[PDB]
Design an enzyme around this catalytic site. Structure first.
Site, PDB file in Angstrom:
ATOM      1  N   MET A 266      51.870  45.464  32.311  1.00 25.83           N
ATOM      2  CA  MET A 266      51.960  46.723  33.030  1.00 25.83           C
ATOM      3  C   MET A 266      52.399  47.835  32.086  1.00 25.83           C
ATOM      4  SD  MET A 266      53.547  45.147  36.587  1.00 25.83           S
ATOM      5  CE  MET A 266      54.287  43.732  35.818  1.00 25.83           C
TER       6      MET A 266
ATOM      7  N   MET B 207      52.585  31.806  43.225  1.00 27.68           N
ATOM      8  CA  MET B 207      53.764  31.840  42.377  1.00 27.68           C
ATOM      9  C   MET B 207      54.324  30.443  42.150  1.00 27.68           C
ATOM     10  SD  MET B 207      55.878  35.249  43.436  1.00 27.68           S
ATOM     11  CE  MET B 207      56.778  35.149  41.889  1.00 27.68           C
TER      12      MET B 207
ATOM     13  N   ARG C 172      61.219  32.794  30.831  1.00 29.75           N
ATOM     14  CA  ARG C 172      61.106  32.253  29.489  1.00 29.75           C
ATOM     15  C   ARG C 172      62.299  32.734  28.673  1.00 29.75           C
ATOM     16  NH1 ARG C 172      56.026  30.078  27.965  1.00 29.75           N
ATOM     17  NH2 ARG C 172      56.198  30.908  25.826  1.00 29.75           N
TER      18      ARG C 172
ATOM     19  N   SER D 243      55.657  44.837  21.522  1.00 33.67           N
ATOM     20  CA  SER D 243      55.383  43.800  22.520  1.00 33.67           C
ATOM     21  C   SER D 243      55.162  44.457  23.882  1.00 33.67           C
ATOM     22  CB  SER D 243      56.521  42.788  22.557  1.00 33.67           C
ATOM     23  OG  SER D 243      56.118  41.655  23.317  1.00 33.67           O
TER      24      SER D 243
ATOM     25  N   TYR E 248      53.533  32.784  23.082  1.00 30.77           N
ATOM     26  CA  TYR E 248      52.379  32.492  23.926  1.00 30.77           C
ATOM     27  C   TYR E 248      51.214  33.411  23.573  1.00 30.77           C
ATOM     28  CZ  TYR E 248      49.263  31.806  27.824  1.00 30.77           C
ATOM     29  OH  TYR E 248      48.145  31.561  28.589  1.00 30.77           O
TER      30      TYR E 248
ATOM     31  N   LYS F 254      60.954  47.995  27.350  1.00 30.89           N
ATOM     32  CA  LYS F 254      59.810  48.425  26.555  1.00 30.89           C
ATOM     33  C   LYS F 254      59.833  49.932  26.335  1.00 30.89           C
ATOM     34  CE  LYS F 254      57.010  44.474  27.731  1.00 30.89           C
ATOM     35  NZ  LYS F 254      55.766  43.890  28.327  1.00 30.89           N
TER      36      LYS F 254
HETATM   37  N1  LIG Z   1      50.289  38.790  32.535  1.00 32.30           N
HETATM   38  C1  LIG Z   1      50.678  39.571  31.434  1.00 32.30           C
HETATM   39  O1  LIG Z   1      50.124  40.621  31.154  1.00 32.30           O
HETATM   40  C2  LIG Z   1      51.801  38.989  30.601  1.00 32.30           C
HETATM   41  C3  LIG Z   1      52.644  39.897  29.784  1.00 32.30           C
HETATM   42  N2  LIG Z   1      53.549  39.308  28.891  1.00 32.30           N
HETATM   43  C4  LIG Z   1      54.168  40.147  27.912  1.00 32.30           C
HETATM   44  O2  LIG Z   1      53.704  39.489  26.582  1.00 32.30           O
HETATM   45  C5  LIG Z   1      54.655  39.794  25.689  1.00 32.30           C
HETATM   46  C6  LIG Z   1      54.969  38.451  24.939  1.00 32.30           C
HETATM   47  O3  LIG Z   1      55.438  37.537  25.916  1.00 32.30           O
HETATM   48  P1  LIG Z   1      55.211  35.905  25.705  1.00 32.30           P
HETATM   49  O4  LIG Z   1      53.949  35.625  24.923  1.00 32.30           O
HETATM   50  O5  LIG Z   1      55.358  35.149  27.014  1.00 32.30           O
HETATM   51  O6  LIG Z   1      56.472  35.552  24.728  1.00 32.30           O
HETATM   52  P2  LIG Z   1      57.319  34.174  24.451  1.00 32.30           P
HETATM   53  O7  LIG Z   1      58.231  33.776  25.586  1.00 32.30           O
HETATM   54  O8  LIG Z   1      56.261  33.224  24.061  1.00 32.30           O
HETATM   55  O9  LIG Z   1      58.178  34.559  23.138  1.00 32.30           O
HETATM   56  C7  LIG Z   1      57.455  35.194  22.103  1.00 32.30           C
HETATM   57  C8  LIG Z   1      58.335  35.211  20.831  1.00 32.30           C
HETATM   58  O10 LIG Z   1      59.481  35.962  20.962  1.00 32.30           O
HETATM   59  C9  LIG Z   1      60.308  35.507  19.707  1.00 32.30           C
HETATM   60  N3  LIG Z   1      61.673  35.609  20.235  1.00 32.30           N
HETATM   61  C10 LIG Z   1      62.238  35.324  21.429  1.00 32.30           C
HETATM   62  N4  LIG Z   1      63.554  35.601  21.357  1.00 32.30           N
HETATM   63  C11 LIG Z   1      63.767  36.049  20.107  1.00 32.30           C
HETATM   64  C12 LIG Z   1      64.930  36.446  19.508  1.00 32.30           C
HETATM   65  N5  LIG Z   1      66.314  36.544  19.997  1.00 32.30           N
HETATM   66  N6  LIG Z   1      64.971  36.869  18.255  1.00 32.30           N
HETATM   67  C13 LIG Z   1      63.804  36.895  17.543  1.00 32.30           C
HETATM   68  N7  LIG Z   1      62.644  36.474  18.129  1.00 32.30           N
HETATM   69  C14 LIG Z   1      62.622  36.062  19.416  1.00 32.30           C
HETATM   70  C15 LIG Z   1      59.914  34.271  19.389  1.00 32.30           C
HETATM   71  O11 LIG Z   1      59.284  34.396  18.039  1.00 32.30           O
HETATM   72  P3  LIG Z   1      58.972  33.226  16.913  1.00 32.30           P
HETATM   73  O12 LIG Z   1      57.551  32.773  17.048  1.00 32.30           O
HETATM   74  O13 LIG Z   1      59.298  33.918  15.595  1.00 32.30           O
HETATM   75  O14 LIG Z   1      59.958  32.109  17.265  1.00 32.30           O
HETATM   76  C16 LIG Z   1      58.854  33.809  20.445  1.00 32.30           C
HETATM   77  O15 LIG Z   1      57.840  32.865  20.051  1.00 32.30           O
HETATM   78  C17 LIG Z   1      55.867  40.308  26.451  1.00 32.30           C
HETATM   79  O16 LIG Z   1      56.037  41.674  26.269  1.00 32.30           O
HETATM   80  C18 LIG Z   1      55.476  39.985  27.870  1.00 32.30           C
HETATM   81  O17 LIG Z   1      56.182  40.836  28.814  1.00 32.30           O
HETATM   82  C19 LIG Z   1      53.877  37.911  28.927  1.00 32.30           C
HETATM   83  C20 LIG Z   1      53.164  36.969  29.904  1.00 32.30           C
HETATM   84  C21 LIG Z   1      52.193  37.586  30.935  1.00 32.30           C
HETATM   85  C1  LIG Z   2      52.725  32.045  38.538  1.00 33.52           C
HETATM   86  O1  LIG Z   2      54.076  32.174  39.007  1.00 33.52           O
HETATM   87  C2  LIG Z   2      54.791  33.115  38.309  1.00 33.52           C
HETATM   88  C3  LIG Z   2      54.243  33.850  37.261  1.00 33.52           C
HETATM   89  C4  LIG Z   2      55.034  34.779  36.600  1.00 33.52           C
HETATM   90  C5  LIG Z   2      54.404  35.469  35.582  1.00 33.52           C
HETATM   91  C6  LIG Z   2      55.303  36.519  34.974  1.00 33.52           C
HETATM   92  C7  LIG Z   2      54.235  36.339  33.788  1.00 33.52           C
HETATM   93  O2  LIG Z   2      54.426  37.170  32.678  1.00 33.52           O
HETATM   94  C8  LIG Z   2      54.178  38.261  33.676  1.00 33.52           C
HETATM   95  C9  LIG Z   2      54.150  39.652  33.327  1.00 33.52           C
HETATM   96  C10 LIG Z   2      55.212  40.246  32.639  1.00 33.52           C
HETATM   97  C11 LIG Z   2      55.151  41.606  32.307  1.00 33.52           C
HETATM   98  C12 LIG Z   2      54.026  42.368  32.644  1.00 33.52           C
HETATM   99  O3  LIG Z   2      53.898  43.698  32.362  1.00 33.52           O
HETATM  100  C13 LIG Z   2      52.962  41.787  33.335  1.00 33.52           C
HETATM  101  O4  LIG Z   2      51.909  42.612  33.617  1.00 33.52           O
HETATM  102  C14 LIG Z   2      50.845  41.961  34.338  1.00 33.52           C
HETATM  103  C15 LIG Z   2      53.021  40.433  33.660  1.00 33.52           C
HETATM  104  C16 LIG Z   2      55.291  38.013  34.635  1.00 33.52           C
HETATM  105  C17 LIG Z   2      55.091  38.685  35.993  1.00 33.52           C
HETATM  106  O5  LIG Z   2      56.241  38.383  36.782  1.00 33.52           O
HETATM  107  C18 LIG Z   2      56.349  35.024  37.002  1.00 33.52           C
HETATM  108  C19 LIG Z   2      56.894  34.293  38.063  1.00 33.52           C
HETATM  109  C20 LIG Z   2      56.100  33.347  38.709  1.00 33.52           C
HETATM  110  O6  LIG Z   2      56.564  32.587  39.742  1.00 33.52           O
END
Ligand SMILES: NC(=O)C1=CN([C@@H]2O[C@H](COP(=O)(O)OP(=O)(O)OC[C@H]3O[C@@H](n4cnc5c(N)ncnc54)[C@H](OP(=O)(O)O)[C@@H]3O)[C@@H](O)[C@H]2O)C=CC1
Ligand SMILES: COc1cc(C[C@H]2CO[C@H](c3ccc(O)c(OC)c3)[C@H]2CO)ccc1O
Ligand SMILES: NC(=O)C1=CN([C@@H]2O[C@H](COP(=O)(O)OP(=O)(O)OC[C@H]3O[C@@H](n4cnc5c(N)ncnc54)[C@H](OP(=O)(O)O)[C@@H]3O)[C@@H](O)[C@H]2O)C=CC1
Ligand SMILES: COc1cc(C[C@H]2CO[C@H](c3ccc(O)c(OC)c3)[C@H]2CO)ccc1O
EC number: 1.23.1.1
Lengths: 309, 309
Positions: A117, A169, A87, A113, A12, A136
């Protein structure tokens, strides 16, 4: 031209980083893993990266020397490994990447990654949401124990998960009539469009100012309370929503009986919107992305929310 | 202008049809179903459709009146409902859409979810693969019993699932050194880029020539044996692949013991590559998309495979 490898390139935030690296002018490599199989959307993302000029590098996390060979090709590695319970939550798989970087020896900087937070600040976090930050931190400790230079990118809610839904949520769209306000709704939260997060990452990954530092993404016009976010929507729509304030104890009621991914979400929303963990400390201009990279004209949340009208 | 509603708008072929309807100038409506929840890629696809001028219509297959209201808005309905066992196989859900179209009464034309082998021709098919054609025939029966005008778009392998992998199952990328050839590799197969399939669909849906007709997508330069397809890749890469010919009896050996979605895939590949079901009959230019719409400069398979270098 800095040579950058993105691991997690179809993720993502990962795919946005790939595109932003290309737009920044980096020589952008993307790790294409052999386990893709019939995952057609992944294959076609990689094709779209190639058309934009990315270079494909084949490797598998189950093949240590393939990872060594991949990171030997670049100056900087960015990891976007999954880290969201609903996810997948595979943060610790990065330990294999760190070990490969250790052996390779040529990598000038690693961005693991992070993108959320600030994990060392979350030692008090509610489980199972705490698994995100503990994991992390284990990766951070492995980075530093390997002597690998780093930048940790933290500090903003992804707009799609927290702004476009008015922070409700289990939905990703603004509510039609009713909105839950967490507490009084006057706790400051940091919001950022994920394409801006991607552009700041692309800009910071070869910036000497951020070598071995945490870089905070805290764009000042995007530091908002939940009430302020909701009132942006109310102006855009011309309709006030019915607001119901949820006290902390009622938000957390019976949390232990929920599905684990929902438990993690509740715990995270608690730290963000009740404890204000994204705004309960200050950061200097020399460690904040919008100050470091003032040429990024970051999207404000009124503009972001207009997409949903 | 023709008003089109696309149901299945975030699908693999559905999203391409949406974009092609917009490029063709149709006033394009997309059905957004309520259950998307945390499916962020679907949500953002709908947002990307709005940005191109699509109109979002909310409705649910469990809310019959919502479907009636949606189809009252348009002249043509295009369904891209799922029809692949290893993804999902919900063809019969279209029966509820046919009912709603029948009650609405304004729809000038319905294109149901076809886009493959010609179901009426597949009465011999191997189960569980045959479920695909049985279910599509059940929908055709309902359409025609209701007197709904129709167009059935059939006849080509999607290039991503059959050309980009040199027709190797369970992968979407060309093989590195060895390739399996089905039989002698001399059976003609029809391939088409899915964006071309979408453009043909957008052009045909208000074409008087195809009202109440089957339209075949059989672009002549893309009628190729598997060996011809492989030889294109060998020429592009300058490397001969090691070819193993698989006899029909060995391809089907022990099919009954495999998982159902793989059984389905095997049965389909058998009809395509051993029995030649896409070329074992001629079709006239008056019922072939590339002849009907010669302004579509369709992508040939050498240019398609060039994307994989
Ligand atoms: N609001 C915020 O600030 C948010 C923070 N985050 C943080 O963003 C970071 C990325 O999250 P997000 O973009 O949702 O990630 P995804 O759920 O999109 O997964 C990202 C990638 O992880 C790879 N992956 C997953 N499992 C494996 C595995 N067993 N072995 C090797 N590769 C794997 C895949 O790579 P490939 O492309 O090679 O298949 C996949 O596309 C995280 O640290 C997350 O906590 C996420 C959402 C909200
Ligand atoms: C919008 O509804 C939801 C949205 C989320 C978002 C998830 C999104 O990726 C977020 C996230 C993960 C790690 C972080 O350090 C973070 O910092 C803001 C956010 C998660 C917060 O629980 C989780 C559960 C829900 O029901
Ligand atoms: N080579 C060929 O000729 C190929 C032919 N096909 C055929 O193409 C057609 C579309 O297949 P494809 O693009 O892979 O489909 P997808 O698997 O991408 O599914 C398409 C859409 O079906 C909707 N859908 C799925 N389940 C339900 C449900 N229970 N209720 C309501 N809607 C549902 C969803 O609509 P929403 O967007 O509303 O979420 C989804 O996006 C099929 O008929 C298939 O057999 C497909 C692949 C290869
Ligand atoms: C590339 O590997 C596979 C490719 C496929 C084809 C899947 C997607 O749909 C292809 C398809 C489905 C219905 C059709 O009418 C069709 O072509 C006419 C093709 C599916 C065929 O089984 C199936 C299994 C595999 O392992």
């Amino acid at each position: 031209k800095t040579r950058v490898l993105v691991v997690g390139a179809t993720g993502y935030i990962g795919k946005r980083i790939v595109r932003a690296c290309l737009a920044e002018g980096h020589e952008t490599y993307v790790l294409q893993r052999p386990e893709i199989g019939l995952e057609i959307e992944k294959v076609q993302l990689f094709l779209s990266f190639k058309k934009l000029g990315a270079r494909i590098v084949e490797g598998s996390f189950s093949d240590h020397q393939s990872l060594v060979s991949a990171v030997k090709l670049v100056d900087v590695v960015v990891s976007a490994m999954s880290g969201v319970h609903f996810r997948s939550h595979n943060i610790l798989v990065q330990l294999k990447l760190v070990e490969a970087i250790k052996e390779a020896g040529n990598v000038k900087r690693f961005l693991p990654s992070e993108f959320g937070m600030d994990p060392p600040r979350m030692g008090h976090a509610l489980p199972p949401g705490r698994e995100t930050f503990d994991q992390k931190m284990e990766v951070r400790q492995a980075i530093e124990a390997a002597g690998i230079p780093y930048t940790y990118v933290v500090g903003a809610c992804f707009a799609a998960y927290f702004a476009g839904n008015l922070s409700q949520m289990v939905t990703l769209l603004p509510p039609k009539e009713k909105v839950n306000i967490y507490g009084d709704g006057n706790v400051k939260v940091v919001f950022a469009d994920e394409d801006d997060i991607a552009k700041y990452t692309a800009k910071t990954l070869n910036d000497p100012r951020t070598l071995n530092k945490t870089v905070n993404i805290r764009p000042p016009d995007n530091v908002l309370t939940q009430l302020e976010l909701v009132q942006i929507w109310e102006k855009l729509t011309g309709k006030e929503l019915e607001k119901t304030n949820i006290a902390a104890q009622d938000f957390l009621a019976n949390i232990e009986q929920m599905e684990i991914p929902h438990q993690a979400g509740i715990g995270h929303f608690y730290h963000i919107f009740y404890e204000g963990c994204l705004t309960d400390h200050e950061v200097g201009e020399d460690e904040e992305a919008s100050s470091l990279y003032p040429d990024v004209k970051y999207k404000r949340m009124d503009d972001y929310l207009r997409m949903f009208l």
